[PDB]
Design a protein around this ligand. Structure first.
Ligand code: CA
Lengths: 196, 551
């Protein structure tokens, strides 16, 4: 298995990758991302894996170390580990090619210090290579871990409890149904045509 | 996040238009990365957040797709009694069950490593411990164990050529997410795929279920429970963070009412019979500035003004407000109109004697916030309507249609009695500090901002590296448009500021660092090359890489 990938830049600087395999298509893709957003992606990955405090912090008031643990609560590393491994070679190549491609340019900045982003010197730390685990983590961390893990159940219950001690338990839940409603008014708007 | 897609029935130039506006908030460098993947079966073009392997917003000359937030309850929390003796042992069924434990190592720069322990029950990880109440709250996800399956299923919409293949890939999705469909033939669709749990009828969706094993899910709903809207009689589909389907309930986190921001986009379809692609692209400008909650209080404020004695009832305020459109036009910093200042302060006075006494003080702020943007930070992104504005709106419905079992927030008062007082209180509030001259009523205009860090608080760049607007626009973090014509397809986006967050160590920036900030401000589009001939012809810089993928 030997091939070639070409990364093309348009008038606005967006890459167009041409390859014959899954590995190559994301090797070039991961490669171009390292050129445009080396520090952002490093800090994105560290945010969703929970290694922010490792480079900066803690603080001001132990905020970094307080999130690194907090993110560890919201993801079980063993579950994702076996999930990735079960994938077929072709499906595994998307994450491997991406990680290997991102590191391809990342080892140029280790050899050519002139290509190092200003952020690394100002923050006084080194760029770290990316793994296929880290690639998946960026999604489930800012994809289904930000827009799909959203929950306000505990604070909704704490509302009932506070109301039930000042108005409850007869009129404590009646005001609770007005503030938070199980089902919406039926008057609201829906994107899917409601029998109309 | 706002998407609106139309079909040739409604557009003059007979084309399937699909405009999507993802709302994540505005950050520097760009939240989004634009790419084209061509080869190995893949032929896609567009942009995606966090430079995902998946292209979230793109077209492939066969199907244009988009995405907004998923409004479905896939996460239930369970409360369990902890043994007063052994705090590390909960209760499932039918006796005390030992809690699982995994310990984690956190590296800290300059300081020694800190060690934590994460608790997990039969349901999931324990998010909160309450020792004195003797209860721990655990988090159960419906999509747990189906993360990578969701990535690939989302990723393979690129391969999809028709509508029926799109659901074949949407079915595999376990997370809650709104998917939108458009193709070259004039067909538009909408899917909201999620692993929906069959939950017991005893469960109150607002609050946690019981962890004593009495209240447990019965499994996963069949795929017919997922909201599916394909080709509608109206000739358009439009979503702005609202209900997924008529026959749907409110998520523990998402509560809607008849006052919804999507009315600011829908209303424009009812304006004309047939519009051009430029006009549908111009639907955004009328939505970026228009006030979200003004549409619903206007008839209440108008009804008062006309029925009021024009003799001396302070009608001078009501006559300067009703002519005002939701738009927030400003002037070199200061707002041109007194109306938005008075509407803001009126809403706060409506909270002061409406949702102040009834709502507990702890989360009182959750209900008594106004919502819309001010020059002073911070700005989330989507204005929308606060919980207090919503409770006030459906209480008006409750007064109009009394339910004897149900309790009203107005109570001993009419809706207009409080409104009248709140308007006078707002006038007295502006008259007390403000110049006190309706002819000078001004609040400083909202300023659009690009954070030097992601939503988590983690810095993407050196502190201070930010961008500002005039100028605030309530739109997407990025704006893409897809047009289909007998000729072909056209991808039209303009993700600001640029596609390069690279700063040369000296200090100079990449030429494409902000080459997309002036056109986003002006609602202009940048053309993305889609057909190979265009990519071949229009590419300025080409670099070739030689590799061999071996174990
Ligand atoms: Ca829930």
């Amino acid at each position: 298995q030997v091939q070639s990938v070409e990364v093309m830049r348009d008038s606005y600087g967006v890459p167009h990758v041409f390859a014959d395999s899954h590995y190559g298509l994301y090797y070039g893709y991961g490669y171009a991302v390292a050129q445009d957003r080396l520090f952002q992606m490093d800090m994105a990955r560290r945010s969703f894996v929970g290694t922010t405090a490792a480079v900066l912090g803690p603080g001001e008031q132990d905020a970094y170390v307080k999130y690194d643990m907090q993110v560890r609560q919201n993801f079980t590393p063993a579950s994702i580990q076996r999930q990735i491994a079960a994938l077929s070679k072709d499906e595994r190549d998307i994450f491997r090619g991406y990680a290997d491609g991102y590191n391809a340019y990342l080892e140029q900045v280790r050899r050519r210090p002139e290509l190092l982003p200003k952020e690394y010197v100002d923050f006084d730390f080194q760029p770290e290579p990316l793994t296929d685990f880290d690639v998946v983590m960026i999604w489930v961390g800012s994809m289904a871990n930000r827009f799909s893990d959203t929950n306000l159940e505990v604070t909704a219950l704490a509302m009932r409890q506070s109301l039930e001690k000042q108005h409850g338990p007869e009129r404590g839940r009646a005001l609770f149904d007005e503030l938070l409603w199980i089902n919406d008014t039926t008057a609201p708007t829906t994107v899917p045509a409601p029998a109309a | 996040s706002n998407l609106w897609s139309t079909r040739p029935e409604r557009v003059q130039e007979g084309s399937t238009v699909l405009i999507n506006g993802p709302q994540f908030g505005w950050y520097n460098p760009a939240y989004t990365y634009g790419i084209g993947l061509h080869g190995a079966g893949f032929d896609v073009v567009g942009n995606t957040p966090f430079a995902y392997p998946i292209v979230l917003f793109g077209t492939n000359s066969e199907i244009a797709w988009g995405a907004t937030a998923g409004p479905q309850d896939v996460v239930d929390i369970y409360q369990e009694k902890l043994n007063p003796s052994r705090a590390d042992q909960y209760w499932f069924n039918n006796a005390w069950r030992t809690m699982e434990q995994r310990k984690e190592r956190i590296q800290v720069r300059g300081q020694a490593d800190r060690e934590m322990t994460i608790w997990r029950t039969v349901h999931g990880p324990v998010m909160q411990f309450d020792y004195d109440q003797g209860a721990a709250y655990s988090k159960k996800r419906s999509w747990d164990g189906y993360e990578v399956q969701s990535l690939l299923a989302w990723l393979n919409v690129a391969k999809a050529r028709n509508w029926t293949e799109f659901l074949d890939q949407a079915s595999k999705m376990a997370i809650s997410i709104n998917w939108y469909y458009a193709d070259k033939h004039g067909n538009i669709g909408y899917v909201s795929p999620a692993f929906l749990p069959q939950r017991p009828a005893d469960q109150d969706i607002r609050v946690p279920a019981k962890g004593d094993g009495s209240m447990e899910w019965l499994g996963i709903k069949s795929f017919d429970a997922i909201p599916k809207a394909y080709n509608p009689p109206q000739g358009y589909l439009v979503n702005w963070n609202n209900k997924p389907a008529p026959d749907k309930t409110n998520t523990d986190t998402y509560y809607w009412t008849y006052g919804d921001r999507m009315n600011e986009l829908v209303s424009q379809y009812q304006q004309k019979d047939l519009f051009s692609v430029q006009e549908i692209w111009e639907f955004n400008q009328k939505a970026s500035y228009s006030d979200v909650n003004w549409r619903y209080f206007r008839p209440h404020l108008e009804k008062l003004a006309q029925q009021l004695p024009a003799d001396d009832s302070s009608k001078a305020a009501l006559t300067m407000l009703l002519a005002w459109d939701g738009m927030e036009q400003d002037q070199g910093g200061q707002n041109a109109g007194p109306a938005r200042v008075l509407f803001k302060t009126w809403l706060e006075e409506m909270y002061k004697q409406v949702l102040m006494p009834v709502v507990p003080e702890s989360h009182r702020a959750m209900y008594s916030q106004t919502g819309f943007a001010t020059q002073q930070g911070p700005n989330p992104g989507s204005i929308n309507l606060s919980m207090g504005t919503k409770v006030l709106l459906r209480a008006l419905v409750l007064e109009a249609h009394p339910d004897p079992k149900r309790v009203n927030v107005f109570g001993e008062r009419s809706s207009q009695e409080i409104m009248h007082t709140a308007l006078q209180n707002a006038q007295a509030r502006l008259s007390q500090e403000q110049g006190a001259q309706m002819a000078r009523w001004t609040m400083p205009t909202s300023v659009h901002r690009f954070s030097d860090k992601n939503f988590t608080g983690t810095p993407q760049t050196m502190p201070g590296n930010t961008f500002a607007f005039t100028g605030y626009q309530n739109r997407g973090t990025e704006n893409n448009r897809v047009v289909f014509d007998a000729k072909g397809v056209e991808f039209c986006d303009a993700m600001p500021p640029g596609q390069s967050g690279f700063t040369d160590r000296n200090g100079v920036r990449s030429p494409h660092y902000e080459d997309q900030l002036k056109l986003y401000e002006n609602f202009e589009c940048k053309t993305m090359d889609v057909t190979h001939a265009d990519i071949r012809r229009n590419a300025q810089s080409s670099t070739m890489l030689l590799i061999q993928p071996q174990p």
